[PDB]
From a paper:
We focused our attention on human RAD51, an ATP-dependent recombinase crucial for homologous recombination (HR) and for error-free repair of DNA double-strand breaks. We therefore explored the possibility of using a more stable orthologue as a surrogate and focused our efforts on archeal RadA from Pyrococcus furiosus, a protein that was already structurally characterised and is closely related to human RAD51. Here, we describe the complete process of generating robust, RAD51-like surrogate systems from this archeal protein via two distinct approaches: by stepwise mutation of the surface of the RadA to humanise the BRC4 binding area (HumRadA series of mutants) and by generating an archeal/human chimera (ChimRAD51) in which all of the BRC4 binding part of RAD51 is stabilised by parts of RadA.
The humanisation series could have ended with HumRadA22, which displays a fully humanised BRC4 binding surface. Nevertheless, we extended the humanisation process further into the oligomerisation groove and “behind” the Ala pocket, in anticipation of the inhibitor design process expanding beyond the core of the FxxA binding site. Overall, the structures of the humanised RadA proteins are very similar to each other, and significant differences can only be seen in loops that are involved in either crystal packing, or are mobile and poorly defined.
Author numbering: 108 to 297, 310 to 349
The structure:
Amino acid sequence: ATIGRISTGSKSLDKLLGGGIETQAITEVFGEFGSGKTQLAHTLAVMVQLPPEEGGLNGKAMYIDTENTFRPERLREIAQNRGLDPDEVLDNVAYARAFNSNHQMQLLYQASDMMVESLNTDRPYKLLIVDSLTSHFRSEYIGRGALAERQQKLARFLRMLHRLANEFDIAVFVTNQVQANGGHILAHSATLRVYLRKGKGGKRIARLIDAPHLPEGEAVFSITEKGIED
Ligand SMILES: [Cl-]
């Protein structure tokens, strides 16, 4: 299947990403608390629903939340300010709370179920958000004696996400709270990594790092009544 791209709402960020976030891939935004990761996720959940000419993939979204970050009223606001029917937009975002790391992995079976049900419809799933990828793994596997198991369980979760991305031709977008002001996670991955931070004058700065097929660079964007914009 053709690799599809979902607009972020920011022309500059889309340019940095080679046109938008990709289907058949896991995009991982990382950065400090307050860097805009959840705002980007919410905006993508709306943008995916739009036609291609408007930055979407005529799709629906599923949003897995681990730290009570999902805000339906924020989706409604983004939808309304983009000229859409907020009730319709909300109906196209399937919410699931993950209570712990084992449940978080269980929810991928539910995701898979929903994706096959919608597959040959005029509105298939095109986006799975996991906000956040790592929080329950970090809270449940603490200290040296649990580190190996944390890594194995997270690796298994990421493998399952890649399977969903590739089997159902969806974009997977995950968030990760990290403090690395150099903008690099040491651990190697098969995610497309974007480092987010606060910039000057209310803006956010995204830095694309370690992509095989896109050059490293930065883009500036704002958080607004429309979600993310330049
Ligand atoms: Cl990976």
